[PDB]
Amino acid sequence: EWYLDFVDLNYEPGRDELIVEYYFEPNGVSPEEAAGRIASESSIGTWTTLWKLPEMAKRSMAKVFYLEKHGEGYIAKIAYPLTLFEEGSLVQLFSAVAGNVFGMKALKNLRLLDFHPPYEYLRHFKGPQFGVQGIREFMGVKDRPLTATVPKPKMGWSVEEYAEIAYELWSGGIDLLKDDENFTSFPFNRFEERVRKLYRVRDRVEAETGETKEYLINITGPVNIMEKRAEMVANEGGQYVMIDIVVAGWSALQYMREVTEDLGLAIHAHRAMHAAFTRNPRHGITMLALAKAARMIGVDQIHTGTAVGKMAGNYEEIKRINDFLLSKWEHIRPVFPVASGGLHPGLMPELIRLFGKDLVIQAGGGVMGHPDGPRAGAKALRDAIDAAIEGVDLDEKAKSSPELKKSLRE
Amino acid sequence: MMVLRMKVEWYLDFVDLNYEPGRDELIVEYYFEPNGVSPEEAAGRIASESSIGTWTTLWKLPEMAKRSMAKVFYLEKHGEGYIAKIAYPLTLFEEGSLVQLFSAVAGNVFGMKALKNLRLLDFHPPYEYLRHFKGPQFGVQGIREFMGVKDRPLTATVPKPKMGWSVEEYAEIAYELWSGGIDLLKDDENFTSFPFNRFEERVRKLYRVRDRVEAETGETKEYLINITGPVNIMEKRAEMVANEGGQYVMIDIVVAGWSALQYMREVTEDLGLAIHAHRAMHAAFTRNPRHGITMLALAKAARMIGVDQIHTGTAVGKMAGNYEEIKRINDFLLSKWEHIRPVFPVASGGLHPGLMPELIRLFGKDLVIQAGGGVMGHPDGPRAGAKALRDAIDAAIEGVDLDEKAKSSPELKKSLREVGLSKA
Amino acid sequence: VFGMKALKNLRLLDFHPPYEYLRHFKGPQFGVQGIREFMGVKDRPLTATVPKPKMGWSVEEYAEIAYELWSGGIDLLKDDENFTSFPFNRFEERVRKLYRVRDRVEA
Numbered sequence A: 001e002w003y004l005d006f007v008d009l010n011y012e013p014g015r016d017e018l019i020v021e022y023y024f025e026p027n028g029v030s031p032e033e034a035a036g037r038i039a040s041e042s043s044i045g046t047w048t049t050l051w052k053l054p055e056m057a058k059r060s061m062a063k064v065f066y067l068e069k070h071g072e073g074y075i076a077k078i079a080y081p082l083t084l085f086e087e088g089s090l091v092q093l094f095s096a097v098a099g100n101v102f103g104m105k106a107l108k109n110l111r112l113l114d115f116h117p118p119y120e121y122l123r124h125f126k127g128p129q130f131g132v133q134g135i136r137e138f139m140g141v142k143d144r145p146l147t148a149t150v151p152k153p154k155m156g157w158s159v160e161e162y163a164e165i166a167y168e169l170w171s172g173g174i175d176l177l178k179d180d181e182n183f184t185s186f187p188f189n190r191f192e193e194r195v196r197k198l199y200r201v202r203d204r205v206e207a208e209t210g211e212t213k214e215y216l217i218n219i220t221g222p223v224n225i226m227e228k229r230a231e232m233v234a235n236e237g238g239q240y241v242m243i244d245i246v247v248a249g250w251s252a253l254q255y256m257r258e259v260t261e262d263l264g265l266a267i268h269a270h271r272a273m274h275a276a277f278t279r280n281p282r283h284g285i286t287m288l289a290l291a292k293a294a295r296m297i298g299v300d301q302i303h304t305g306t307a308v309g310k311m312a313g314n315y316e317e318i319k320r321i322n323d324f325l326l327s328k329w330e331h332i333r334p335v336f337p338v339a340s341g342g343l344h345p346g347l348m349p350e351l352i353r354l355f356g357k358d359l360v361i362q363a364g365g366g367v368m369g370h371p372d373g374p375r376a377g378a379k380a381l382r383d384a385i386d387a388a389i390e391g392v393d394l395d396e397k398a399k400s401s402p403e404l405k406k407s408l409r410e
Numbered sequence B: 001m002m003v004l005r006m007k008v009e010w011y012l013d014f015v016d017l018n019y020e021p022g023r024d025e026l027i028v029e030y031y032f033e034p035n036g037v038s039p040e041e042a043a044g045r046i047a048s049e050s051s052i053g054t055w056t057t058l059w060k061l062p063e064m065a066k067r068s069m070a071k072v073f074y075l076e077k078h079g080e081g082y083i084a085k086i087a088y089p090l091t092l093f094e095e096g097s098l099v100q101l102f103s104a105v106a107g108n109v110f111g112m113k114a115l116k117n118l119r120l121l122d123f124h125p126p127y128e129y130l131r132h133f134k135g136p137q138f139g140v141q142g143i144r145e146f147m148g149v150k151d152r153p154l155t156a157t158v159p160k161p162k163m164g165w166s167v168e169e170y171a172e173i174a175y176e177l178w179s180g181g182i183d184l185l186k187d188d189e190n191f192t193s194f195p196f197n198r199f200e201e202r203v204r205k206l207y208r209v210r211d212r213v214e215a216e217t218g219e220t221k222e223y224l225i226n227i228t229g230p231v232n233i234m235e236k237r238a239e240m241v242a243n244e245g246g247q248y249v250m251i252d253i254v255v256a257g258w259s260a261l262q263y264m265r266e267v268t269e270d271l272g273l274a275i276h277a278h279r280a281m282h283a284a285f286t287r288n289p290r291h292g293i294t295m296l297a298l299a300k301a302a303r304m305i306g307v308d309q310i311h312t313g314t315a316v317g318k319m320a321g322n323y324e325e326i327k328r329i330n331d332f333l334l335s336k337w338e339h340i341r342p343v344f345p346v347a348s349g350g351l352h353p354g355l356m357p358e359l360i361r362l363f364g365k366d367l368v369i370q371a372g373g374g375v376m377g378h379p380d381g382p383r384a385g386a387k388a389l390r391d392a393i394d395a396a397i398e399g400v401d402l403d404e405k406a407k408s409s410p411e412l413k414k415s416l417r418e419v420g421l422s423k424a
Numbered sequence C: 001v002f003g004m005k006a007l008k009n010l011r012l013l014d015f016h017p018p019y020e021y022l023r024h025f026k027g028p029q030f031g032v033q034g035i036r037e038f039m040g041v042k043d044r045p046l047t048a049t050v051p052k053p054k055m056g057w058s059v060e061e062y063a064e065i066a067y068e069l070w071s072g073g074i075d076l077l078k079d080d081e082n083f084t085s086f087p088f089n090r091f092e093e094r095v096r097k098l099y100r101v102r103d104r105v106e107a
Helices: A031-041 A090-097 A131-139 A159-172 A191-209 A223-235 A250-263 A287-297 A315-326 A345-355 A364-368 A374-390 A402-409 B039-049 B098-105 B139-147 B167-180 B199-217 B231-243 B258-271 B295-305 B323-334 B353-363 B372-376 B382-398 B410-422 C031-039 C059-072 C091-106
Strands: A017-026 A063-070 A073-081 A107-116 A146-149 A176-178 A214-216 A240-244 A266-270 A301-303 A336-339 A360-362 B007-009 B025-034 B055-057 B071-078 B081-089 B115-124 B154-157 B184-186 B222-224 B248-252 B274-278 B309-311 B344-348 B368-370
Touching: A017 A031, A031 A063, A031 A073, A031 A107, A090 A250, A090 A287, A107 A287, A131 A266, A131 A336, A146 A364, A146 A374, A159 A176, A159 A191, A159 A374, A191 A214, A191 A223, A214 A240, A223 A240, A223 A250, A223 B258, A240 A250, A250 A266, A250 A287, A250 B231, A250 B258, A287 A301, A287 A315, A315 A336, A315 A345, A336 A345, A345 A374, A345 A402, A364 A374, A364 B055, A374 A402, B025 B039, B039 B071, B039 B081, B039 B115, B098 B115, B098 B258, B098 B295, B115 B295, B139 B274, B139 B344, B154 B344, B154 B372, B154 B382, B167 B184, B167 B199, B167 B382, B199 B222, B199 B231, B222 B248, B231 B248, B231 B258, B248 B258, B258 B274, B258 B295, B295 B309, B295 B323, B323 B344, B323 B353, B344 B353, B353 B382, B353 B410, B372 B382, B382 B410, C059 C091
Parallel strands: A146 A176, A146 A360, A176 A214, A240 A266, A266 A301, A301 A336, A336 A360, B154 B184, B154 B368, B184 B222, B248 B274, B274 B309, B309 B344, B344 B368
Antiparallel strands: A017 A073, A017 A107, A063 A073, B007 B055, B025 B081, B025 B115, B071 B081
């Protein structure tokens, strides 16, 4: 059996079939053959063999129904019957549509652009437990973006040193303390010691300020360890855990979604390592597909990138990802985009004008750098956010917030 | 009259080309190309973002920050870029957690605007890092022992087509493959559990067939059964396999991920199961020679945690990946490495009986040889194909010409004739 | 009592528990007779050997020395007091191998 049996550019996919879109460049074969190879490798493969062909194999063939020239290559869209899939298992879906296909010698490059799961696939995924509205409610923040802050330096803090910095950041106005992706558990900062202490400091600051404060605490590890750590956070009164979802990976993430369902924890998804496969525009998996999978399983917050006078990724791509994350999508609650990357108070209006108010804004570097110290930097960050939301020029505001003034000089 | 200290840390402070790392530091080798910054600055950015980062702050530095800095100690031009080697103190690591190691050395660094491209080439764990990994439970010698196969490569076959089989149809093809001489039935990376082939129904049936073939042939047969799934599911499926008498599970380790793998290694330690790692999805990040993570590094992580066998690529006409790269990976997999047992390279990609002499000459006898199409495609059927593969391997090992062997092996004779009829 | 400044030296020589104290102790499960019975050795003393050197053996190297010792007539293989569990000789890996060797030598 041959690759062109998987190609039919007149086929019209049913509403119960899953669609994957790929960019590809052929290597020594026709665009049609290459697309047929993708469909084959991601479904039943080849046969031809004197052996009895299994009865479900014809009903499991993928079909390329769209193929067009695009830049230096081609886009194919391919339809997949649900007989190919273990329903509820994102892991098995990606084993099919994002696996061996990337190694095929008959392609120069292959990029998985997007996928579109039908109702009968999507209904076996819960999506986020809280999402934007869930978080807004437990944080008590109805309208403005939320603020987050990873301390600098990002490693090396003892439990006590971390308690002290956390008190300054939260007290100065930060909503969310954030651990660095590399900051898990060390001899001088054991995870359970950190939990015991940091939630007591959190509760003290809530009592002194009257505002809800939370901790994007890094539970990343071997799954059994991440589960135990999630249990410790819940037992101490935490409503968030942070997981490096790409480093940890899809099998752990799906299970952890069941763990956090029982313990009432929102998931903050850090995407470290993503750029190993999401950066190259000709090859890998797009950040959009990654986000879509992550939203389906049910992260409540995820990093996507920013636009920024020093930093800044592709505006269009970021806005496409964010629009998807906030979009209506059947029962799947919307996800907060997390904006990070050289953010500081002066950038807040624009970040907000361009990306809206439904954001978690991570700005630790600017907060830690304030000339009056971290607590003043946090206020400067809340103070320029309030001004964006209200339509006030940052130089007017600065007349009644010297922590923002001191920030604007630089 | 207070004098305060603004602490400043910058990228070039992470570069010291005269630094001599201790034997108890972890070393990572990177290839990179700078974008708009000096090679020094780029290298510094890597060391920084994989360690303590940079910053400007009045706040008191945490005491362990200065002892947690990575240092660039080697930096030289390489092709259109540069190689850096970077040294890491173990204070930066949660020991036993490869998840955390990779979050540091293989994380945010790949997304840095100031690098055009970034590839992690290799890493070298010091003894005090490595000693908190068990490595493979069985490795080469353990598998050889339970399979009862002392010298020759082992054989494996994934049925064709790769999806759609009912439990009964899969039992019938398995009987053929095993009976004709294949050592290891192998599930496709996509083939987990379906309405028409439920995992637990498949285990009950196939291990009965397995045991029947063992009784009939006097040879040990095994099954690289795909337990890939959400971690709890993978765990339950591993328990079902062990319960039925199985000694192997297959995990799609890249799609599943490191966190699940590390835990599954504890599960399999308890159940006596060897792990066959399928690497589907790797090429999304291992294929670009300028950017990503090499198959060698992935393989090293997987060996350290403890997969017992892993796919590395082959040298064929019809699948030839780079000979140099592949041989490097296999050499590593099989090399002495403290207490870490050696791992079988799994060779796959259009193999058939006529390639066995070349495959063995070039890559040795310590291989698992997966020969799907070649076996399933034999003109006399899959049983005959399996025999042809086993006979070609016995000949390669004995230094006997394939056409000489074919005189006492009808299956091998037909297989050889077909290649010629299907070759341009 | 050992730290009292009013004593220059103190040595506990022996103690003698009365029946109502001693009765709340089981003593050995096996003792001499229990051991002789499960070892199948009725009269002669039993023999034991700790390998030399005392440390540094891998599981497989430890299996090979044990085979020699047991096969030549030693009754009891013995670990050195410092030999617990190491990266190159993990206790559970040792247990699995050494008892298979043990059963082989018995056969």
